[PDB]
Amino acid sequence: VDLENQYYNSKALKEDDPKAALSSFQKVLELEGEKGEWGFKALKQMIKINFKLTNFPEMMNRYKQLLTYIRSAVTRNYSEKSINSILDYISTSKQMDLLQEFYETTLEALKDAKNDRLWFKTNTKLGKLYLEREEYGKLQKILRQLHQSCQTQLL
Q: How far apart are the first and last CA of the chain?
């Protein structure tokens, strides 16, 4: 059906250089991201090139583009692992000051009810950064939501 968008995701896949890799990726997405399955894998790859090669302000624009494809386009199974590993790369690489903006802006998109372990595991790990920060005020609101999720995890 959409044999076009599948191969331009794979044509813009190799590259090696970031140079113009992200412009040909965007020509896959912006052939109308109708289904959003190859709009996701176009942007997913753009993220792994943006944060790793210096440009985090440019990244967060594309980061929030990706988070649109959760209620539609992609299932929660694959989209769960997508943000997991993209935070694992930024967790070990950059520090608190570039990691915490993405933890918050993730949960903004996760205004979700059926997300239990998807919602809880981001919110549990938001409550760890706020202890190093000395941000105890908002940290209590985080713990109030966490505690109210159960009333395994209540420990």
A: 49
Token match 């713990």: residue? 143
Resolution in A: 5.5
Specify whether the backbone of 17 is left (phi greater than 0), alpha (psi in -120 to 50) or beta.
Answer: beta
SS3 sequence of 84-144: HHHHHHHHHCCCHHHHHHHHHHHHHHCCCCCCCHHHHHHHHHHHHHHHHHCCHHHHHHHHH
Closest CA to 47 of 114, 5, 93: 93
Q: What technique solved it? A: X-ray
DSSP characters over 29-67: HTS--SS-HHHHHHHHHHHHHHTTTT-HHHHHHHHHHHT
